[PDB]
Amino acid sequence: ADGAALYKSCIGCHGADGSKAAMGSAKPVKGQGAEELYKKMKGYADGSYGGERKAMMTNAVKKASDEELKALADYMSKL
């Protein structure tokens, strides 16, 4: 699959232009940067980055294999 496909679900917590209030006050995804987003999204998928509220997101992003991980960051980096 590829990032774009996953994001469609992600809208639930991040909104379109990755800025809605997630599980409380959270940094907006809104073009942090592909580097940042990749490392953080990778962090979550791998389980290196996370926390209580992140648990849902962790499993959500966990579905992303590799193409997906990279592309999700790339996509989010222009959103």
Binding site for ligand HEC (CB under 6 A): 6-7, 9-10, 12-14, 22-23, 26-27, 29, 32, 37, 40-41, 53-54, 56-57, 60-61, 72
Residues 6 or more apart whose CB falls under 8 angstroms from that of 24 comprise 53
CA dihedral 44, 48, 53, 57 (to 10 degrees): 20
Q: Do the annotations mark residue 13 as ligand-binding?
A: yes
| Shortest CB 18 distance to ligand HEC, Å | 8
Measured CA to CA, the distance from residue 70 to residue 79 in angstroms comes to: 15
Nearer to ligand HEC by Cβ, of 9 and 48: the residue is 9
